[PDB]
């Protein structure tokens, strides 16, 4: 069986989870306080200079997308930690 669906389904409305996890304020960015208190409940995320090169302190769709298509190897991105 393929997964070319459920992961394309998964992966879409993962980068659009992220987004608006992170962006309940309808900001449209992710503010550093944002990011500040999650991250006390999510430490298995990078740091804000690794999800934003700008070091903006503000993570945009082209972050995440990136960061998506960044850390993705053969066909998901896994390697065991």
């Known amino acids: 069986k393929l997964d070319q669906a459920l992961v394309?389904?998964?992966?879409?409305?993962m980068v659009?989870?992220?987004f608006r996890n992170f962006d309940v304020d309808?900001?449209?960015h992710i503010s550093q306080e944002e990011?500040?208190?999650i991250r006390g409940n999510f430490?298995?995320?990078s740091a804000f200079g690794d999800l934003d090169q700008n070091q903006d302190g503000c993570?945009?769709?082209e972050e995440m997308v990136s960061y998506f298509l960044r850390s993705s190897s053969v066909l998901g991105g896994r390697m065991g930690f």
């Open 8 to 13: 394309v389904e998964h992966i879409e409305k």
């Open 16 to 18: 659009e989870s992220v």
């Open 59 to 61: 993570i945009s769709r």
């Open 43 to 45: 430490p298995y995320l």
């Open 26 to 28: 309808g900001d449209g």
């Open 35 to 37: 990011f500040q208190i």
